[PDB]
């Protein structure tokens, strides 16, 4: 009734499994943490930081209004903050 | 006689690996202040 792979219950009760995975699992959790604590995730994805949704005296959404200049429009908006 | 690396192994890690990473990023997110 099995297809040949090692049973899960057998794997995750085994010492070797946990010898490998007590390193890998925290390492990934730390890496994802560092993805955010370093601020890198903001830059990769383009997401506004808490201080860069608006310019200081601005209350207008920087809304993309053009299909083919869209890219330029976003960049123009970002200048209004630097 | 059980293999270690299988289609199953790949499918598992294909979901499990980014899930833990994302869990880490989201946990870091709870300490963000405005």
């Amino acid at each position: 009734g099995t297809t040949g792979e090692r049973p899960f219950s057998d794997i995750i009760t085994s010492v070797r499994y946990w010898v490998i995975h007590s390193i890998t699992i925290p390492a990934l959790f730390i890496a994802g943490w560092l993805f955010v604590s370093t601020g890198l995730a903001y830059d990769v994805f383009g997401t506004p930081r808490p201080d860069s949704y608006y310019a200081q005296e601005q209350r207008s959404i920087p809304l993309v209004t053009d299909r083919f200049e869209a890219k330029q429009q976003v960049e123009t908006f970002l200048e209004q903050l630097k | 006689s059980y293999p270690i690396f299988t289609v199953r192994w790949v499918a598992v890690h294909t979901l499990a690996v980014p899930t833990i990473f994302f869990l880490g990023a989201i946990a870091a997110m709870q300490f963000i202040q405005r």
Binding site: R16, V19, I20, T24, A27, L28, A31, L40 | I4
Partner: peptide
């Protein structure tokens, strides 16, 4: 930039540690 290798070192070390711990039984 520098944040990319900081984000990347635990991943590669984890893969390193796992590669050298399973390597005998993967060769079989």
């Amino acid at each position: 930039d520098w944040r990319v290798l900081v984000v990347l070192l635990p991943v590669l070390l984890a893969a390193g540690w796992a590669v050298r711990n399973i390597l005998p039984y993967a060769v079989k």
